[PDB]
Symmetry: C3
Subunit: 183 residues, 3 copies
């Protein structure tokens, strides 16, 4: 349905150049474009799989030896893309689930699976660092639905030994709600 | 008078879960709830000592092996708690004092002592990292009073070899004032 | 024309004290005053070279063994100073150039040379870390002028093996423009 493309670079200038080139190269939307660590840079793009593969090929080729890593995740539910670039709005607040993973790939796949197997809202997906760092997703919905989402996402990261922790919180305390849903 | 409770975790999901649980567990107010370093998480709570000990016991027990450290500081002047969660308002601007310490414990105890031995306003308490990192307090008041506060806070951190630096600045330059008092 | 003074310290309290003292010491303007890394602090000042040398001597002497490094860059074009403290406004948007360097010294000298050899606007100068970290400048102007600026700045950092990467982007994509010009 949509693809996600990721490109991580050692150079900020190279990253702006690559972001520019990738956007001109194909019909894709920028989801993420930011520096991280002591001078690294991360681009994430979405769009149809052909356009994303073409963007990330362009960018990988431009990156040369300043490339940390790049990846194309095909077949990602469309609702995941806005959870990566911002926050989705919460349509139902009974429970919150959070799944924390090693690597943004594990976290996107887990969220995709969560959204495909349940009816929760994927509220947001957050990366501590880069492609290889700690990442976590937050889901919101009725307690049964959140339980199911979290189970599937946990299983998904867990098969690969990349699950860090999972939690279902029915009725989140008012003092934690905003942080959970806005970051 | 109030207690401060601190809980530091290796997991963001676990931290949200623990924050939620601690708040439901006892009558305490969240002062701090934030990620730090490459994917760590810090909770700080305040309230009556019984409620804080009960919150932090709950959270410590939930944390398991994802716990970095937890602590309860009893008997902390109430004015310290808002300096931890935000900024106290400045009632008098003649001088600013700053004491920088190793560890937020050394810094809270030093600030408490400062406030108990002088009449300064504790404007804010700031942590670079977590529980074990660099922290500093800023006080404001008449120059004599600030001198006394800074002396006591310095002595307090210094007894333990945790004083990093101390400074009294009568009449702070206009170009540094806001940074001193707002961070 | 103007000088830039830089003072990097291991102590935040010492840094506030030194910033205060440097500003009282000479007719200089604070450009930068911020913490970085796990509890470091950076001051940058501008003004006439005499006043900047006097400020930084004062601050170096105050810093003692908490000094990481200090430097005075004489003869810097005035337009560089606002690019360090904020953003200069863009008067012409045909192309953007970006030069990324090792060390803020290499980056300021390169930008100065860029501005002295071309007619571009220096939009901003950015530091990832401190004095020794990754830094980059962004210039904007007609494509020929930007090509010339970037060439000169590249040569300048490159003579010393401190050039990381350089890029000219005629017609920057709308989705990258704001990040390029505002950071």
């Amino acid at each position: 349905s949509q693809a996600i493309g990721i490109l991580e670079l050692t150079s900020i200038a190279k990253g702006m150049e690559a972001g520019d080139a990738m956007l001109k190269s194909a019909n894709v939307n920028l989801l993420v474009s930011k520096t991280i660590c002591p001078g690294k840079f991360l681009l994430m793009l979405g769009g149809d799989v052909g356009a994303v593969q073409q963007a990330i090929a362009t960018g990988t080729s431009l990156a040369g030896d300043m490339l940390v890593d790049s990846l194309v995740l095909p077949n990602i539910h469309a609702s995941v893309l806005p959870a990566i670039s911002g926050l989705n709005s919460v349509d139902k607040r009974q429970a919150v689930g959070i799944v924390e993973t090693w690597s943004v790939a594990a976290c996107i796949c887990a969220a995709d699976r969560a959204v495909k197997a349940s009816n929760v809202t994927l509220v947001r997906v957050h990366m501590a660092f880069g492609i290889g760092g700690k990442c976590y997703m937050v889901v919101a919905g009725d307690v049964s639905d959140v339980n199911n989402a979290v189970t599937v996402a946990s299983e998904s990261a867990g098969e690969k030994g990349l699950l860090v922790y999972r939690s279902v919180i029915p009725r989140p305390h008012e003092s934690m709600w905003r942080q959970m849903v806005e970051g």
